[PDB]
RNA sequence: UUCAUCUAGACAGCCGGACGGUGGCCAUGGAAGUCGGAAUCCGCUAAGGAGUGUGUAACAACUCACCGGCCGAAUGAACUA
């Protein structure tokens, strides 16, 4: 489901609590896995801007809580290197929740969206207000 | 008429293409099958342009345009701006726009005559849209959503809107847009109707998983529908 | 599904090795849903209250409402019933299948 | 579409063989013993199943 | 009722009208024809039983005018054809059978698969 | 031009499903093909097998039924198996039935062709009680009168 | 080791023929010797089954039963270590 993306710096390991950018009632997401992650002894699998993570809701609507459901990172605080040269980074981490196809459950996104997420996922760019 | 096709394996066409009355825009990473949809049906009337915007392939959601003009965001480079000013005709004007709201496609829903913009867009853009596109600008939201370009496909004839939309507010917009409006779903139950499909006067292209009752609703409000080769020879 | 049963001593076999002697038609509603292949993936096991079967017939019928939907908009409920086949066997406490381990 | 004069021409190379039961080898249909050594030249042969 | 048309998806070409459609509506539902039988190599031996589907997923039409150069040129017993503007596999022709997905038999068959084609009314819009 | 002697089997009223595939490369028809078959099976029973051949060129109809097989012995009768087991009074009309049958049977006239249509009739009662095997072994009827 | 075949022509192979009522009849989308049920008839023949197997959607084609010559001293089966 996930296409080709150039490697960017991994800023979100397992156990991170990122914000929730959409309007599906959830307040923050708790990352428990990264889809397509590697395998190394004692290594925590880490996420990045645009990866697809399995995540639970720790705060928000009680209907959304206590179930594991996939999510997509839209902002990142660790600085990454774009190919055209610049090192950039947002202010906080953020994610939106999705079905395992990649379609989005929320209606809109507040805050800016990273550009390598809008190219990779077609639904996130449809609901994005500001692209970087 | 009502042709269906898809970019690489995605149903949404409005993200990856921008179809107007006098030109067309497509992203560069396409197969031979996706390009042959527009080339076979538009012919040589309007110029098809392969382009990218801001280093992206989402040019249907970054740009905003109609018959008379095109608006591109700030991160569009000078190499991509000089390419568009050649391939498009001399009638259309291309203008770079300085925004905090970068994605102009989700923000602006426009045609030849009447445009709806996001309510938190600023006044220096409202002066810019009305003088470049030559369109009256109306600040208004689709009943529950601020992204008016993603959830409301619009043409000169009619306009398809978000499915969860009250009838009492459709009559508001039809009073404002002066075109008849129908709510519906495209791509087998996706509420994002502006990003699923594109439209102009003589063509409307949507995704491959658009079902047959959904395709009836599209061509009806847009009024693009209308035989001797078929017959019995026994 | 299949549920094991002590014909003499009235016990129930759990999947690994257990022999939980439960009261008949009171809390066997609660001991079955561990043995069932289906996990917590089904929506919200919102309710479960089994319906009557004949006491001579060796089967148990149950009803339940999973109620949690994710069909892209809403959470629409759904009601269904499944059946269980009772199988009797020995349970070596109740079988006496005797000689080293005397301790 | 296959023109069964040519289907009989191809089935001699594909279907009309025999299979050893022990080593699963592909053998000629008139054979009596398997030609390999890792099954010990065994003679328990079966015909190959037709479609 | 009114006449209808069968337009090709991704071609937008009218392949077949009504005044066609030999619809053969009832399946048999009995054990010899309503079920799909897979025998064995020998001795009339049933290995599989498959139940037929709900609705007949084809359109059995008369041989039409646009089909004629594929049926005159290299005339064979079975094959397939396409839309005349996209070269996509729409339906096959067969002078044997291929009952329906739902199962009867037909006649020598000109089947038009209802996957990747759709049916629209020939009259005006419904105006909902 | 071109001649083509095909074939046709079974049917009582109309059928030709098997043949229908034979007219694929040939002249395509469904209406006149069952109509030309209807001109063949006119006043023929639909229970019985009707074996025929049709010769055609540019939709040409042919209806011939040589009947040198069991088609004759099923014709002169009254209509997990519909039993054809009858006590037929054939022996007088079987002298007339073998007359139409022995067009070439390639035997020395009727006396060696009175046993072909006899054992071809593999069901009927014939004349009297039985008319099969030893009940029609020695033929002392008509015979040389037909020669 | 024990059987059995063969110069009175084997085994192995090659060369010919295998016809005519006839796509026999019910049975079925279709079954012509060969998906199956039950009958086993008759013509001609040197000899030839309402067919021994391979096959085709159904035929065809081919093989086998059976009849002829062509070839020239070996061959088949079980078993023991």
Domains and CATH numbers, chain B: 1-226 (3.75.10.10)
Domain ranges for chain A: 11-132
Q: Using the beta-carbon criterion (under 8 Å), do B102 and A125 form an inter-chain contact?
A: no
Using DSSP bridges, classify how beta strands B24-26 and B48-50 pair: parallel, antiparallel or unpaired: parallel
Cα(B16)–Cα(B116) distance, rounded to whole angstroms? 21
Cβ neighbourhood burial of B157 (10 Å; 0-12, 13-18, 19+): middle
The token duo for B201 is 């006067």
DSSP state letter for F64: B
Cα(B52)–Cα(B81) distance, rounded to whole angstroms? 10
Q: For residue E4, give Cα distances in angstroms to A1, B220, F117.
A: 39, 16, 58
DSSP state letter for B79: H
Q: For residue F106, give Cα distances in angstroms to B203, F32, F111, F118, F136.
A: 78, 37, 12, 16, 20
DSSP secondary structure of F70-125: THHHHHSS------------THHHHHHHHHHH-SS-SSSSGGGSTTHHHHH--S--
Exposure b/e, C3-42, CB count within 10 A at least 16 = b: bbbbeeeebbbeeeeeeeeeeeeeebeeebeeeeeeeeee
Residue owning tokens 């825009």:
B25
Determine the nucleotide nearest to E97 by Cα–C1' distance.
Answer: G29
Cα(E67)–Cα(B232) distance, rounded to whole angstroms? 10
Give SS3 for A81. Answer: strand
Subunits adjacent to chain E (3 or more Cβ pairs under 8 Å): B, D, F
Residues of C whose CB is below 8 A from A105: 72
Structure's resolution in angstroms: 3.5
The token duo for E118 is 């759709």
Angle subtended at Cα A73 by Cα A67 and Cα A77, rounded to the nearest 5 degrees: 125
Q: Which residues contact F25 (CB under 8 A, 6 or more apart)?
A: E75
Using DSSP bridges, classify how beta strands B2-4 and E78-82 pair: parallel, antiparallel or unpaired: unpaired
Cα(E60)–Cα(B140) distance, rounded to whole angstroms? 52
Neighbours of C58 (CB within 10 A): 14
Q: If you measure CA to C1', which residue is closest to nucleotide G29? A: E105
Give SS3 for B69. Answer: strand
Phi, psi of B195 (to 5 degrees): -85, -20
Cα(A36)–Cα(F133) distance, rounded to whole angstroms? 85
Query: For chain B, what is the largest distance between any 2 Cα atoms, rounded to a whole number of angstroms?
Result: 70
Q: Using the beta-carbon criterion (under 8 Å), do E14 and B3 form an inter-chain contact?
A: no
Q: Using the beta-carbon criterion (under 8 Å), do A126 and B144 form an inter-chain contact?
A: no
- Protein D29 CA to nucleic acid G12 C1', in Å? 18
Could you tell me if B202 and B19 are in contact, meaning their C-beta atoms sit under 8 angstroms apart?
Answer: no
Exposure b/e, A5-42, CB count within 10 A at least 16 = b: eeebebbbebebebbbbbbbbbebbbbeebeebeeeee
Q: Is A123 within 8 Å of chain B by CB?
A: yes
The token duo for A69 is 């459901």
Q: For residue B169, give the nearest of B101, B116, B221 by alpha carbon.
A: B116
Could you tell me if B217 and B14 are in contact, meaning their C-beta atoms sit under 8 angstroms apart?
Answer: no
Cβ neighbourhood burial of E33 (10 Å; 0-12, 13-18, 19+): middle
Half-sphere exposure in the Cβ direction for F82 (13 Å, CA): 7
The token duo for E77 is 């017993």
Phi, psi of A72 (to 5 degrees): -130, 130
Closest residue, chain A, to B144 (C-alpha): A107
Residues of A whose CB is below 8 A from C70: 99
Determine the nucleotide nearest to E41 by Cα–C1' distance.
Answer: G35
Structure determination method: cryo-EM
Cα(F20)–Cα(A126) distance, rounded to whole angstroms? 57
Q: Which residues contact E104 (CB under 8 A, 6 or more apart)?
A: E24, E26, E27, E28, E33
Give SS3 for E54. Answer: coil
The token duo for F91 is 């022996």
Where is C32: in which H helix or E strand?
A: helix C28-35
Residues of B whose CB is below 8 A from E127: 220
- Closest residue to E75, CB basis, from F20, F21, F25: F25
Q: For residue C86, give the nearest of C28, C16, C23, C18 by alpha carbon.
A: C28
Give SS3 for B87. Answer: helix
Angle subtended at Cα B195 by Cα B102 and Cα A91, rounded to the nearest 5 degrees: 35
Residue owning tokens 């150039």:
A6
Could you tell me if B142 and B120 are in contact, meaning their C-beta atoms sit under 8 angstroms apart?
Answer: no
Using DSSP bridges, classify how beta strands B2-4 and B204-206 pair: parallel, antiparallel or unpaired: parallel
Could you tell me if A111 and A75 are in contact, meaning their C-beta atoms sit under 8 angstroms apart?
Answer: yes
Fold of A11-132: Ribosomal Protein L14 (2.40.150)
Neighbours of E103 (CB within 10 A): 18
Cα(F42)–Cα(F55) distance, rounded to whole angstroms? 18
Exposure b/e, B200-234, CB count within 10 A at least 16 = b: bbebbbbbbebeeebbbbbbbbbebeeeeebeeee
DSSP state letter for B142: B
Q: Which residues contact E18 (CB under 8 A, 6 or more apart)?
A: E3, E4, E5, E122
Cα(A94)–Cα(A91) distance, rounded to whole angstroms? 10
DSSP state letter for A44: P
Could you tell me if F10 and F49 are in contact, meaning their C-beta atoms sit under 8 angstroms apart?
Answer: yes
Touching pair F, A by Cβ (3+ pairs < 8 Å): no
- Protein D43 CA to nucleic acid G68 C1', in Å? 39
Rounded to the nearest angstrom, the minimum Cα separation between E54 and chain B is: 19
Cα(D41)–Cα(D34) distance, rounded to whole angstroms? 5
Could you tell me if B142 and B132 are in contact, meaning their C-beta atoms sit under 8 angstroms apart?
Answer: no
Cα(B193)–Cα(B173) distance, rounded to whole angstroms? 17
Cα(B47)–Cα(B40) distance, rounded to whole angstroms? 13
Cα(C13)–Cα(C21) distance, rounded to whole angstroms? 9
Q: Is F143 within 8 Å of chain B by CB?
A: no
Residue E6, beta-bridge partner list: E16, E119
Helical residues (DSSP H) of A1-132, grouped into ranges: 115-120, 122-127
Where is B183: in which H helix or E strand?
A: strand B181-183
CA C37 to chain centre: 11
Phi, psi of B175 (to 5 degrees): -70, -30
Residue owning tokens 């009803």:
C63
Cβ neighbourhood burial of F112 (10 Å; 0-12, 13-18, 19+): middle
The token duo for A103 is 């379609």
Could you tell me if B54 and B73 are in contact, meaning their C-beta atoms sit under 8 angstroms apart?
Answer: yes
Cα(B130)–Cα(F66) distance, rounded to whole angstroms? 92
Subunits adjacent to chain B (3 or more Cβ pairs under 8 Å): A, E, F
The token duo for C5 is 């049963």
Cα(E109)–Cα(F24) distance, rounded to whole angstroms? 11
Q: Which residues contact A117 (CB under 8 A, 6 or more apart)?
A: A49, A50, A72, A73, A74, A124, A125
Q: For residue B101, give Cα distances in angstroms to B117, B122, B144.
A: 11, 9, 19
Could you tell me if B82 and B102 are in contact, meaning their C-beta atoms sit under 8 angstroms apart?
Answer: no
Cα(E40)–Cα(E48) distance, rounded to whole angstroms? 9
Q: For residue B71, give the nearest of B28, B34, B16, B108 by alpha carbon.
A: B108
Determine which of A24, A114, A116, A131 to mutate to test the interface with B (most B C-beta atoms within 10 Å): A131
Using DSSP bridges, classify how beta strands B114-117 and B108-109 pair: parallel, antiparallel or unpaired: antiparallel
Could you tell me if E13 and E84 are in contact, meaning their C-beta atoms sit under 8 angstroms apart?
Answer: yes
The token duo for A76 is 């990142």
Q: Using the beta-carbon criterion (under 8 Å), do C72 and A99 form an inter-chain contact?
A: yes
Handedness of CA B101, B107, B110, B113 (dihedral sign): negative
Phi, psi of F99 (to 5 degrees): -70, -40
Cβ neighbourhood burial of B155 (10 Å; 0-12, 13-18, 19+): buried
Using DSSP bridges, classify how beta strands A94-97 and A17-20 pair: parallel, antiparallel or unpaired: parallel
Residues of A whose CB is below 8 A from C72: 99, 103, 105
SS3 helix, strand, coil % of chain E, rounded to 5?
Answer: 5, 30, 70
Residue owning tokens 């009314």:
E121
Q: Which residues contact B170 (CB under 8 A, 6 or more apart)?
A: B161, B181, B183
Give SS3 for E91. Answer: strand
């Amino acid at each position: 489901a996930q296409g080709t993306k150039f490697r960017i710096s991994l800023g979100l390991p397992v156990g991170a609590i990122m914000n929730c950018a959409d309007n599906s009632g959830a307040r923050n997401l708790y990352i428990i896995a990264v889809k397509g992650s590697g395998s190394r002894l004692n290594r925590l699998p880490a996420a990045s801007l645009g990866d697809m993570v399995m995540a639970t809701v720790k705060k928000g609507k009680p209907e959304l809580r206590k179930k594991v459901m996939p999510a997509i990172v839209v902002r990142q605080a660790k600085s990454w290197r774009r190919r055209d040269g610049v090192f950039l980074y947002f202010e906080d981490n953020a994610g939106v929740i999705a079905n395992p196809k990649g379609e989005m459950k929320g209606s809109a996104i507040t805050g800016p969206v990273g550009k390598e997420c809008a190219d990779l996922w077609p639904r996130v760019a449809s609901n994005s207000g500001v692209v970087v | 008429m009502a042709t269906r096709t898809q970019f690489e394996n995605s149903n949404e066409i409005g993200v990856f293409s921008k179809l107007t009355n006098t030109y067309c825009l497509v992203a560069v990473g396409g197969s031979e099958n996706f390009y042959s949809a527009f080339e076979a049906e538009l012919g040589d009337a309007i110029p098809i342009v392969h382009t990218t915007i801001a280093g992206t392939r989402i040019i249907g959601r970054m740009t905003a345009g109609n018959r008379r003009g095109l608006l591109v965001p700030t991160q569009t480079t000078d190499q991509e701006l000089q390419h568009l000013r050649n391939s498009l005709p001399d009638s259309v004007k291309i203008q770079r726009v300085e925004e905090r709201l970068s994605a102009l496609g989700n923000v602006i829903c426009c045609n030849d005559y009447v445009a709806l913009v996001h309510p938190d867009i600023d006044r220096e853009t409202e002066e810019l849209i009305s003088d470049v596109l030559g369109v009256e600008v109306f600040r208004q939201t689709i009943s529950g959503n601020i992204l008016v370009g993603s959830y409301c496909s619009l043409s000169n004839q009619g306009g398809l809107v978000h499915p969860q939309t009250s009838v009492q507010d459709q009559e508001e917009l039809s009073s404002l847009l002066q075109v008849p409006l129908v709510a519906g779903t495209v791509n087998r139950g996706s509420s994002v109707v502006g990003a699923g499909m594109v439209v102009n006067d003589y063509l409307a292209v949507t995704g491959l998983d658009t079902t047959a009752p959904e395709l009836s609703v599209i061509e009806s409000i847009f009024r693009l529908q209308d035989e001797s080769i078929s017959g019995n020879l026994r | 599904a299949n549920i094991s049963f002590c014909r003499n001593c009235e016990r129930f076999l759990q999947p690994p090795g257990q022999w939980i002697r439960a009261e008949l038609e009171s809390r066997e509603l609660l001991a079955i849903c561990l043995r069932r292949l289906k996990g917590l993936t089904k929506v919200r096991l919102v309710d479960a209250s089994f319906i009557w079967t004949e006491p001579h017939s060796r089967r148990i019928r149950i009803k339940l409402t999973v109620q949690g939907e994710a069909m892209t908009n809403t959470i629409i409920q759904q009601t269904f019933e499944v059946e269980y086949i009772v199988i009797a066997m020995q349970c070596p406490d109740c079988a006496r299948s005797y000689t080293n381990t005397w301790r | 579409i296959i023109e069964p004069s040519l289907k009989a021409l191809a089935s001699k190379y594909n279907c009309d063989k025999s299979v050893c039961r022990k080593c699963y080898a592909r053998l000629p249909p008139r054979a009596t013993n398997c030609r390999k050594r890792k099954c010990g030249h065994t003679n328990q042969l079966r015909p190959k199943k037709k479609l | 009722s009114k006449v209808t048309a069968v337009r090709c998806k991704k071609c937008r070409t009218k392949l077949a009208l009504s005044t066609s459609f030999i619809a053969h509506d009832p399946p048999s539902k009995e054990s010899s024809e309503g079920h799909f039988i897979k025998r064995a190599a020998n001795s009339h031996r049933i290995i599989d039983i498959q139940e037929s589907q709900a609705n007949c997923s084809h359109f059995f039409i008369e041989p039409l005018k646009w089909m004629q150069p594929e049926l005159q040129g290299k005339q064979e017993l079975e094959g397939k054809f396409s839309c005349p503007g996209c070269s996509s596999k729409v339906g096959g022709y067969n002078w044997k059978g291929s009952r329906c997905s739902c199962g009867k038999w037909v006649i020598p068959a000109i089947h038009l698969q209802t996957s990747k084609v759709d049916q629209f009314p020939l009259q005006s819009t419904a105006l909902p | 031009x071109x001649x083509x002697x095909x074939x046709x089997x079974x049917x009582x009223x109309x059928x030709x499903x098997x043949x229908x595939x034979x007219x694929x490369x040939x002249x395509x028809x469904x209406x006149x093909x069952x109509x030309x078959x209807x001109x063949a099976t006119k006043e023929f029973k639909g229970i019985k097998v009707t074996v025929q051949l049709k010769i055609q060129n540019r939709q040409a109809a042919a209806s011939v039924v040589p009947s040198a097989s069991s088609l004759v012995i099923t014709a002169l009768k009254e209509p997990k198996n519909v039993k054809h087991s009858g006590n037929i009074q054939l022996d007088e009309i079987i002298x007339x039935x073998x007359x139409x049958x022995x067009x070439x049977x390639x035997x020395x006239x009727x006396x060696x062709x009175x046993x072909x249509x006899x054992x071809x009739x593999x069901x009927x009662x014939x004349x009297x009680x039985x008319x099969x095997x030893x009940x029609x072994x020695x033929x002392x009827x008509x015979x040389x009168x037909x020669x």
